[PDB]
Amino acid sequence: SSRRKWNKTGHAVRAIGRLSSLENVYIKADKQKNGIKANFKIRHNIEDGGVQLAYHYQQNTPIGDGPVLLPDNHYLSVQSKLSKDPNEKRDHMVLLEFVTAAGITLVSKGEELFTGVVPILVELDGDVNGHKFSVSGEGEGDATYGKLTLKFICTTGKLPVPWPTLVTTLVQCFSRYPDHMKQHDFFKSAMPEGYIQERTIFFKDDGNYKTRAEVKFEGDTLVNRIELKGIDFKEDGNILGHKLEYNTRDQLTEEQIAEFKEAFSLFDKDGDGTITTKELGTVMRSLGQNPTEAELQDMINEVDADGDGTIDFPEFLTMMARKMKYTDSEEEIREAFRVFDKDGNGYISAAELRHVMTNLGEKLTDEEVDEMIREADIDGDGQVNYEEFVQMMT
Ligand SMILES: [Ca+2]
Ligand SMILES: [Ca+2]
Ligand SMILES: [Ca+2]
Ligand SMILES: [Ca+2]
Question: Is the bond preceding residue 119 a cis peptide, omega within 30 degrees?
Answer without folding.
Answer: no
